[PDB]
Amino acid sequence: SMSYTWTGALITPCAAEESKLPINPLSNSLLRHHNMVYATTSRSASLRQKKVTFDRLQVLDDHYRDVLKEMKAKASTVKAKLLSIEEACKLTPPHSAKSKFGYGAKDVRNLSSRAVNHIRSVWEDLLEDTETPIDTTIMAKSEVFCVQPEKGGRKPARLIVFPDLGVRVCEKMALYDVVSTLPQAVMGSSYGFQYSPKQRVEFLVNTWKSKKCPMGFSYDTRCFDSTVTESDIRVEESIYQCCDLAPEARQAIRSLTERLYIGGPLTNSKGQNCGYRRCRASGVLTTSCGNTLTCYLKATAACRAAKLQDCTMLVNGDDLVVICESAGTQEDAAALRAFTEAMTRYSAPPGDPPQPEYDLELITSCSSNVSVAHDASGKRVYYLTRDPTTPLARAAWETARHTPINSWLGNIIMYAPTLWARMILMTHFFSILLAQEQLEKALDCQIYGACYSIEPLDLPQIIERLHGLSAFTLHSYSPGEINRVASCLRKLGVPPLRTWRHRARSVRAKLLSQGGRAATCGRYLFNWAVRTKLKLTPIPAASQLDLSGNFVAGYSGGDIYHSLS
């Protein structure tokens, strides 16, 4: 059983694609070694196809089956609603890809009769037809990176695979409530996406302290999406089907699974057949939910197979953290070998073999880690940080070129307490946004895979919700964190942190000189910048402001939209 089959027709672009950065004063202002920064393109898709195309040998044992039955019994608890066409339409991102059938996301949100009548038609088809493979498009994705310390080798583009806009809206009607509700119900504490960054570090610490002699390790699968077998996707359906479901919801899930999720034909931008998928599609609604469940299940079973004791995992799609009781240095390494041997039998080998860790801080997952800092009162605070290379590289791209998804905004929101996000990112973009009249224009960003639409001037509020107000006061970051940040500036050619401090003094002055929510941006975001730091107090409409069901689940490649909060 092969993950993909190719006819030889190319993965084709729809427009021109820029690779290298353009040299302009504003990006220079941030980053100097321009030629360290690249965007991916169609040209490398070939390469990506090679990494992602293989055969899958799966062998399931009793541990796996036991864990499934356990997961399923929890899933039996769920009652999931069928969404209305309207409800589902309003979950569609305004810039989601337009349909083959003469209407785009705008029309769907407007509930254009062409759109809703097509969607109704696509819905009925899921009820009438139970086997005909549903068309998907395959595209090379445009993502920006910094090149490897390994000379001049670049990641090839990733491949997105997604059904037409009308299918996608149906997917929401059928499966949205499921995909939002079930993972927590089945996986409890282990379900990553139920956690704000603050809550995620909380859970990791409390877990780490709850052990007598702790021992954590990160796991990650070489192309998880290709390792997802047809069987995996039907197992995953069997979990979903344990929900109380509307009859048409049950069939829709039944049809989507056979027709779309287990695989199907791949069409390119030009309309020709590239071939066939027998693994997970990156761009369906159930991708993140599927990946997480599948990973949780395979992982959980692999512990019991390697007799690790008191495992507590955190799962975010493909990304797996595990913290457990240690059996001694030499044992641990041997058990972790066996974990991997199990996962591999379940068709999920790792990129790089897990290595046991005896400090929580050295464990990295979802590209991020726990680091330590202190607040005003000097009492020691835990927060979530990241190697700033890729964030800064993208910040330099989105400065010198208009991007659909403003990644820098996402990172400030998410990594608000971190060193580099405050001193470099915040300063750089509030500088730009002030020069060009544009603090109030709402910008599109991406949190946990869902598209959000946020105004810069609501950042003190938002940051306070997620990380608390202490995220405006942290000051004594760990040596290793400062060492890592500093070495990253040297790599990309970013002016050392000293430099941003005055760029930021100027910068808190511009904002106080303007009142309103603009001023409390200056005051709160840049209290690290003045040497005569004033005190900070819980902002008014700044949590009890706007609330919702935001950070309750992930929708990576799931086409989900929240202007929420």
The answer to whether residues 274 and 264 touch, using CB atoms and an 8 Å cutoff, is: no
Q: Among 177, 318, 332, 559, indicate the residue that binds Mn ion (CB under 5 A).
A: 318
- 204 in Cβ contact with 360 (< 8 Å): yes
Cβ atoms of 386 and 369 closer than 8 Å: yes
What is the smallest separation between the CB atom of 3 and ligand UTP, expressed in angstroms? 12
The interface region with ligand UTP, picked from 201-209, 280-288, 480-488, 495-503 by CB under 6 A, is 280-288
Nearer to ligand UTP, 142 or 461 (CB): 142
Instruction: Give the residue ranges of DSSP H helices in 100-222.
Output: 105-110, 113-128, 165-187, 197-210
One residue of 107, 177, 225, 236 binding ligand UTP per CB under 6 A: 225
Is the Cβ–Cβ distance between 502 and 521 less than 8 Å?
no
**CA-CA distance, 145 to 396, in Å (whole number)?**
10
Q: Are 402 and 441 in contact (CB under 8 A)?
A: no
Near ligand UTP by CB under 6 A: residue from 99, 371, 556, 565: 556
List, in order, residues 6 or more apart from 505 with CB less than 8 Å away. 529, 530
Residue 278 CB neighbour total at 10 angstroms: 18
Nearer to ligand UTP (CB atom), residue 156 or residue 468? 156
Binder of residue 96, out of Mn ion, ligand UTP, none (CB less than 5 to 8 A by kind): none
> Judged by CB under 6 A, does residue 164 bind ligand UTP?
no
How far apart are CB 320 and Mn ion at their closest, in Å? 8
What is the distance in angstroms between the CA of the first residue and the CA of the last residue of the chain? Answer: 45
556: partner contacted, choices Mn ion, ligand UTP, none (Cβ within 5-8 A by kind): ligand UTP
Nearer to ligand UTP, 291 or 312 (CB): 291
For ligand UTP, give the closer residue by CB, 55 or 437.
55
Q: Tell me: is residue 458 an annotated ligand-binding position.
A: no
| Shortest Cβ 101–Mn ion spacing (Å) | 34
Q: Which of residues 186-225 bind Mn ion (CB under 5 A)?
A: 220-221, 224
x/- map, 288-327, ligand UTP, by CB under 6 A: ---x-------------------------xxx--------
Residue 282 in contact with residue 225, Cβ under 8 Å? yes
Q: Was 318 annotated as part of a binding site?
A: yes
338/79 Cα distance (integer angstroms): 38
By DSSP bridging, strand 159-162 and strand 144-146 are unpaired
Residue 205 to residues 193, 216, 314, 328, 365, Cα–Cα distance (Å): 17, 11, 12, 21, 14
Q: How far is the CB of 350 from Mn ion (least distance, A)?
A: 8
Q: How far apart are CA 326 and CA 215, in angstroms?
A: 6
Q: Is 319 annotated as a binding residue?
A: yes
Instruction: Closer to Mn ion by CB, 194 or 255: give it.
Output: 194
Chain positions contacting Mn ion, by CB under 5 A = 220-221, 224, 318-319
Instruction: List, as residue ranges, the binding site for Mg(2+).
Output: 220, 318-319
Chain positions contacting ligand UTP, by CB under 6 A = 141, 158, 160, 220, 223-225, 282-283, 287, 291, 317-319, 556-557
